[PDB]
From a paper:
With the exception of the M. thermoresistibile target which did not contain NAD, all other mycobacterial SDR target crystal structures contained NAD, which appears to have co-purified with the protein after expression in E. coli. For each of these crystal structures, the adenosine mononucleotide portion of the cofactor binding site is enveloped by the inserted residues and only a portion of the nicotinamide ring appears open to solvent (see representative examples in Fig. 2A and B). In addition to the insertion loop which covers the adenosine portion of the cofactor, a second loop which typically contains two α-helices covers much of nicotinamide mononucleotide portion of the cofactor. In contrast, this loop is ordered in each of the mycobacterial SDR crystal structures presented here. The combination of the insertion loop which covers the adenosine portion of the cofactor and the ordering of the second loop which covers the nicotinamide mononucleotide portion of the cofactor results in a significant decrease in the solvent accessible surface area of the cofactor in the mycobacterial SDRs, relative to other NAD- and NADP-dependent dehydrogenases. Only a small portion of the nicotinamide ring appears available to solvent in each of these cases, indicating that the NAD cofactor is tightly bound and potentially non-exchangeable. The structures presented here have a cofactor solvent accessible surface area of approximately 18 Å2, whereas other NAD- or NADP-bound dehydrogenases have a cofactor solvent accessible surface area of 82–89 Å2. Given the encapsulation of the NAD cofactor by the two loops in mycobacterial SDRs, a large conformational change would be required to release the NADH cofactor after a redox reaction had occurred. To test whether or not the bound NAD was exchangeable, we performed a number of line broadening and STD-NMR ligand-observe studies, and did not observe exchange of NAD/NADH during the timescale of the NMR experiments.
Author numbering:
A (entry chain D): 1 to 157, 167 to 282
B (entry chain C): 0 to 156, 166 to 283
C (entry chain E): 1 to 157, 166 to 283
D (entry chain F): -3 to 157, 168 to 283
E (entry chain A): -3 to 160, 166 to 283
F (entry chain B): 1 to 157, 167 to 283
Write the structure that this text describes.
Amino acid sequence: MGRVQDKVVLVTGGARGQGRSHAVKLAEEGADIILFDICHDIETNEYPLATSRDLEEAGLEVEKTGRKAYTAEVDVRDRAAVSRELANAVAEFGKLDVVVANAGICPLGAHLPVQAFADAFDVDFVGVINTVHAALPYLTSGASIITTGSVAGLIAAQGPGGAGYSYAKQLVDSYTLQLAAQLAPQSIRANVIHPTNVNTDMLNSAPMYRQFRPDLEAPSRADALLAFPAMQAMPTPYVEASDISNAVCFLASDESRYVTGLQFKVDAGAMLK
Amino acid sequence: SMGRVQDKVVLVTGGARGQGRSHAVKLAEEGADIILFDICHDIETNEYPLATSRDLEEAGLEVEKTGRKAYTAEVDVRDRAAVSRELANAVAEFGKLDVVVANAGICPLGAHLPVQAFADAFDVDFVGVINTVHAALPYLTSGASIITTGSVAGLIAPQGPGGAGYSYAKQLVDSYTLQLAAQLAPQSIRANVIHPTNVNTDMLNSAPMYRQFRPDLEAPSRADALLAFPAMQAMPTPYVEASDISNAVCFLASDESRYVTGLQFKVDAGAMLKF
Amino acid sequence: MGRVQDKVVLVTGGARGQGRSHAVKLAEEGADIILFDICHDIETNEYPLATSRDLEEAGLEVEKTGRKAYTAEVDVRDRAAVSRELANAVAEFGKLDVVVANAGICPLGAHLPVQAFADAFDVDFVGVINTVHAALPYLTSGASIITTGSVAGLIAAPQGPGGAGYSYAKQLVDSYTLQLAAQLAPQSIRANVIHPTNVNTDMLNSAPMYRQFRPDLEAPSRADALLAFPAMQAMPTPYVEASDISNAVCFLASDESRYVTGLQFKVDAGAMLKF
Amino acid sequence: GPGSMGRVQDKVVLVTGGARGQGRSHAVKLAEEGADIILFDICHDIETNEYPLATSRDLEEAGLEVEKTGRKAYTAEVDVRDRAAVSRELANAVAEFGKLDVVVANAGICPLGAHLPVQAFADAFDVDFVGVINTVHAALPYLTSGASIITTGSVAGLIAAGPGGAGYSYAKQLVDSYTLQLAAQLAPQSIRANVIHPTNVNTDMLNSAPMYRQFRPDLEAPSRADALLAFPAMQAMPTPYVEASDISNAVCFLASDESRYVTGLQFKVDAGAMLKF
Amino acid sequence: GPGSMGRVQDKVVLVTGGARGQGRSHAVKLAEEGADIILFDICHDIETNEYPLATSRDLEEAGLEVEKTGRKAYTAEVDVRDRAAVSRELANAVAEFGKLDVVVANAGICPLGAHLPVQAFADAFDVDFVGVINTVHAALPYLTSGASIITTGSVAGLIAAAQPPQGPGGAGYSYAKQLVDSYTLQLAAQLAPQSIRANVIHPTNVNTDMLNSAPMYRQFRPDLEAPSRADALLAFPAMQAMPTPYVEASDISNAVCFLASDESRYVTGLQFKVDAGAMLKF
Amino acid sequence: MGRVQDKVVLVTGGARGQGRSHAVKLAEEGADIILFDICHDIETNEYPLATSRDLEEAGLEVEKTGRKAYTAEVDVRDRAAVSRELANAVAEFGKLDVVVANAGICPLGAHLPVQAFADAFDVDFVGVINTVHAALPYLTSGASIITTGSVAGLIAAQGPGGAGYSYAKQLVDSYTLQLAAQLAPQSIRANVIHPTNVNTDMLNSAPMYRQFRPDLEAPSRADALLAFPAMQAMPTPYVEASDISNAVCFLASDESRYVTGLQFKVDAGAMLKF
Ligand SMILES: NC(=O)c1ccc[n+]([C@@H]2O[C@H](COP(=O)([O-])OP(=O)(O)OC[C@H]3O[C@@H](n4cnc5c(N)ncnc54)[C@H](O)[C@@H]3O)[C@@H](O)[C@H]2O)c1
Ligand SMILES: NC(=O)c1ccc[n+]([C@@H]2O[C@H](COP(=O)([O-])OP(=O)(O)OC[C@H]3O[C@@H](n4cnc5c(N)ncnc54)[C@H](O)[C@@H]3O)[C@@H](O)[C@H]2O)c1
Ligand SMILES: NC(=O)c1ccc[n+]([C@@H]2O[C@H](COP(=O)([O-])OP(=O)(O)OC[C@H]3O[C@@H](n4cnc5c(N)ncnc54)[C@H](O)[C@@H]3O)[C@@H](O)[C@H]2O)c1
Ligand SMILES: NC(=O)c1ccc[n+]([C@@H]2O[C@H](COP(=O)([O-])OP(=O)(O)OC[C@H]3O[C@@H](n4cnc5c(N)ncnc54)[C@H](O)[C@@H]3O)[C@@H](O)[C@H]2O)c1
Ligand SMILES: NC(=O)c1ccc[n+]([C@@H]2O[C@H](COP(=O)([O-])OP(=O)(O)OC[C@H]3O[C@@H](n4cnc5c(N)ncnc54)[C@H](O)[C@@H]3O)[C@@H](O)[C@H]2O)c1
Ligand SMILES: NC(=O)c1ccc[n+]([C@@H]2O[C@H](COP(=O)([O-])OP(=O)(O)OC[C@H]3O[C@@H](n4cnc5c(N)ncnc54)[C@H](O)[C@@H]3O)[C@@H](O)[C@H]2O)c1
């Protein structure tokens, strides 16, 4: 008897990092997962995104719990693709209970053109809209929508991609609260998780290193690692994907049936600074 | 098969009934030994009954039924010295203290009540929280979790002096918890505040609360108030249940929430979205 | 000679109303125009959108000035389509200087489902994003991006989910436009948002809008609504005319505003002065 | 040319500080667009303002620059701090031109410098806010439905939300809030009021020893080439300033029936300045 | 009395609007505490302000009441709207007393009424904000280290800020009183280096001819077409948190005396509410 | 007849510093005074607090004016003790007119444990609550409650103790205005005085010197004096206790009968630096 027993969960960006961690955690707690991921790079985003193989490994990891996995290569900027693959996924499972709008990029770097802003926004905000809007027809009383924000985003309230990332995340937050209001009469909840630094390929990337160590020409991971902890008030350079998955599991579960419009910081006190 | 608070020691003030009892039992089910403090007598300005001695005994027995230990004591959180004394005794018995649930509270509503109602709501609902937290501090070590009970209706601000005192105390419980979270973060001790909307307990289900929800009748019954309760929430419900708050408490008390601190944890069925 | 001599201007929602008025004014001032419009209805929006005929007539009115018009039936919710048609128009006109993201719906009604919120948002915000993001590759030094907000939307910061979606979309058009102005400023490209009050077009003169303005009546006529329209303005008028917005569009599109960027350009007859 | 119909055709416009800089620029642009201009300027220095103000010849030449467009000009040396003089000279100008349509309350000083006494606060405030009040309150009895009042604020002023610099910013902050109060009061009569907030403008005010010293506090006493290196920091667009003509284009829009329903607008011409604040 | 040492002993105080009301009260209080007084008042009506202002006699009687304390009084009929006249008479007054220590910029009108034209906005603003400016600025070159500038605000004025009838004059009054407040703090910051103080006093309802006026009764009883004083007196107390319809001029003079006195030598930029708790309702 | 003629005033922290200055000023103006002070040190507060002798001498100073003094050793953290001694004092003096909740500590130091936060808070906020709540049953129309804030506190909105101090002082402010609202119908007033730096033992202390000169390891007074003036807009390193007592006297006197809910800065313009 798991904490999300027999629920069906959509996870965007589910191939690796937080998304894969959420898929596995929820499956461990008794849910079947629909995993969507781009599975190829975006040009202005100067670290590798997930591969086809990552998404496969992610399905396998889920299946290993005894739950079922639907996998699809889908770009969240493509609504029709999201709609299409979601109908397929529902066909297999018959239901959709939880939406985890987790996919995102962080195309940082001051030398990048304004396209990087557009790309950060298209994926990080518009892709979230596309995800929820595609998912709404399928949701009934008791459904839970979970969106991924960013503490660094809220603080901003790095170049064109950084700016677009921050502003997209501020809108993920305010949009989530609008959605919460709109869906509350139907007992469908919507909440935003705001992580601080998370130990994933997004954080452990060359553009992110240069962001934390602007004093250095070519900072290494070891150099950035010295600057990582300043973001948190607790003594840690980052939280783990598991820390985010714990909050996702709480919000996915009927345990949180009356939690909606919550700005759920998993930040090690970053916002207390 | 480990519990979510496996072998932790938790203090719960106001543990005799309502949310506090629900928190005790929930955390005991999840593998924690529980220290329950409750005043077990009424407060004059507060015009509905508080917990009785039989309540506290029954709370302790319900915890013991899970196979965990319960330490129960009649303690008024307005009494710093008595809080520290009993807690010393309980920590000595249980070995350690991992979690603090500063839940005890009163809601002394009524337009007719004197200023004492302000001072009483403030003394219990804020000063009592401070006294609970400060008495606990010397025992807490890295990974400890402090959980305070706020109130959405609080944050949103005929209620009288007791209602003004209630609202202001709850506002300060919120700013205080966040201030404490900043000071405790370098030691990896967390502090977070839960803000319930309406909760189905003796505090909500009380004559002064019914007068507050129905300012248009002079002696409204529960049936009259129950018609007005839903206005508070955005989701179609008159209140949430004690189990809903316990679920938030369990999450914050568990190592699942090791990097969650300074959070204003609304369990409010959308109440704050109407503001 | 003209105030936008030889410029090329994309106008979305160009078939009628403010959009067509912008096209014609800008053509009269020396610019060639690309006019996009959906030319069909949207189910949650309970008034008719422009027709194929409206769009052809708008193109003709542009050409009447002696300048060139490129028309295309295009849903701003479809970015592929916006990009495809803009490509065709640019290969014909050789250039793109000014973007007027004017297309919008106002799907009011207290009886409408949450779909109405998504449709308002998809068109009014995502449609603006799609428009601008499609235009971005083509812009050079001195380019001008003009978006259309709404005073009533700002103020929002019964109308039903559609009204909520509308208001929120317009708030985001505003904050998005300023963020984009910041990012484009290094290349001397500007972005400004125009916030009209009531404008005398089919959006304002529509059955859902009459009900919005007369919630005291079950079945208000235009005449009943026209009595309420002036309350929105501080000046004694029921609305501004499309020509008033077009005058502001022409300033922003002209080289005369080369250093005007990040401006929230109210043409509201004092509507915001009522806070 | 002869018989052109302009954007401000046949209007009568009052422009304070119309002797040089933005004021002269507005006077000319509005003349080119068909308006007859009443120009007011103090035409002497102010002791706390440590750069020279306009001269009598400057004003005359502003009148001449106007007539060169084909339009009529009325000039008077008037200190906006003297409401009686404002009233007396305006009443002369209206009886002779027969009407008043537009008010450009542009007169201003910027008496910067850390060493100056508090009088520099009083002088900045008396000219830049009281003189604006003096201008408007004097002109009001003449205005009817369709008139347009246009006050000059300042982005640097808004952002700030020595003693002369403190008085300048605060005065500009009040120009802004006062213009919006006035717009609300005059809306029922269909009279409009709006404020233009320039960033750096290439004028004698920006090109002054006090300003250079303010932009470059690092040099003990700097020059124009020095300042011109630190002017750009103020704008988001890659420029050290806007020109007087950029402001005159906004003025022309607000003076014109084109902007008949535009009121209470905080009209930034700032090259993106405010997007850094 | 004369032979002993008062709280403003041997100071010289300018009070504008000194002919009656709070101004006359301030003058007499300060003189009992050892100060000589310069009393300025307009001593004639303003047309948009639909209640009588002070009379020439009022001003004479105020000087005499100052003199009855044993101190010296200097009176002049001055419109605070005319800076040239403020500066001219202030020079004459200072030349006669030799010094200026305290400025109390108290002169004001409240030209309320729905029916009045926009001139009532301009008149409220010219008297209540521009008059205060002309008062302070005319005084500045006479002030040395230790001087104290005291401006009269208004709680009702401030409350109106937070708030989104009173007519053009009412709007000009509230906006003017909001500017008195922000202006006094700006001035306080600019004068602090010279050890010159500036503070603003914000009264709630005060029992004077301004409060006891036909336009004020319409303001307090908008439900009545022609409310009397008795009608208005039922609504007056709603402004205060303490149970009273108004404070007295003496209450305001007590705060003026504190601020004028060397007792408050390090008090500056203070927003000094004397409001019986009015601001606790907003 | 003095400005507080025949009133009975309770002053907490009355042994020395501002509290003793308030006592003697009010006594000179005709009031009998009740003086409470802890009269021993608090471990996390690394400068000496008042002694038994300070308190007794403070009472003698009051008596010298011809008025009566009642002194008691009382830790304002102990409400039971505050109530008991106050019942004793009121029994003797017959009534209670004015409460001046002045007792405080400032336990600064970056090295100190979180206990210093709790101690600063227990004394400087809960201590004030205890004082006011213990006095409420004695108060009638015209009574005046005067709490002591801190400009440095308001600006903050140093170590755990510093943070505890600033936060406590911020709540003294908001609490005092709540109390004013609640007591207004009884015509009982409550006002908060916010001082800037005051020339007392709290300011003239090694932890305060380290606070104003974080760039040094053992700052002397001379080192700290170079930095004290930056806090004020007027050219002074601090105000004196007498400046604060002057404000206390105004608020204690019937002269301020209608002043309530006031945040009374005596800050030499500190807050004008925002
Ligand atoms: N890592 C951090 O420090 C941090 C902090 C705050 C928030 N976040 C957010 O958490 C979320 C998860 O990121 P992560 O930390 O797991 O990094 P990650 O890069 O490992 O995971 C992001 C995943 O989303 C996928 N993705 C990217 N663009 C997509 C698109 N258009 N369509 C479909 N899938 C796409 C990627 O392939 C990748 O698998 C993101 O929204 C990110 O912005 C991360
Ligand atoms: N019930 C609601 O609608 C609601 C909403 C928001 C917040 N809250 C808060 O939740 C908390 C729990 O209240 P509840 O709903 O369980 O009601 P409850 O009255 O059933 O529980 C409160 C308990 O605290 C005890 N208590 C009260 N004063 C005490 C004191 N001085 N010392 C020790 N124990 C004391 C009572 O005896 C009782 O057992 C309170 O802080 C309350 O303010 C309640
Ligand atoms: N009329 C008002 O009172 C008012 C007030 C404030 C703001 N606005 C805004 O002004 C803008 C113009 O509207 P209007 O007043 O001219 O009304 P309108 O309905 O006459 O014009 C809207 C035009 O946009 C077109 N359109 C709608 N959805 C589209 C889509 N998805 N793709 C392409 N075209 C689409 C319509 O067919 C129509 O031609 C809108 O953005 C509106 O929100 C209007
Ligand atoms: N130049 C800038 O960078 C800048 C930036 C923002 C705002 N402004 C504002 O723009 C306005 C125009 O100034 P400018 O840039 O043209 O500089 P300027 O010094 O060339 O023009 C100011 C003109 O006003 C006149 N003047 C000054 N005091 C007067 C008085 N008391 N009475 C009558 N006339 C008086 C001067 O003689 C001068 O001709 C001013 O209000 C100024 O504060 C200027
Ligand atoms: N009465 C209240 O309820 C109240 C409340 C808040 C603030 N105030 C303020 O207190 C101040 C004094 O008013 P009061 O209550 O004593 O009323 P009041 O009308 O009795 O006194 C105002 C005095 O100022 C004089 N005066 C008016 N305009 C003048 C001018 N232009 N030049 C010189 N003198 C002028 C009047 O003749 C009169 O003597 C005013 O600033 C007022 O706005 C009054
Ligand atoms: N000195 C400053 O710079 C300054 C600035 C702002 C505010 N304040 C406030 O002024 C007030 C008085 O301080 P001061 O400057 O006279 O310093 P001080 O240390 O000389 O005096 C404080 C007095 O309170 C007493 N006291 C401390 N804890 C007590 C307790 N628990 N119970 C009873 N008495 C206790 C002390 O023994 C001492 O006599 C304090 O609230 C302080 O925080 C001081």
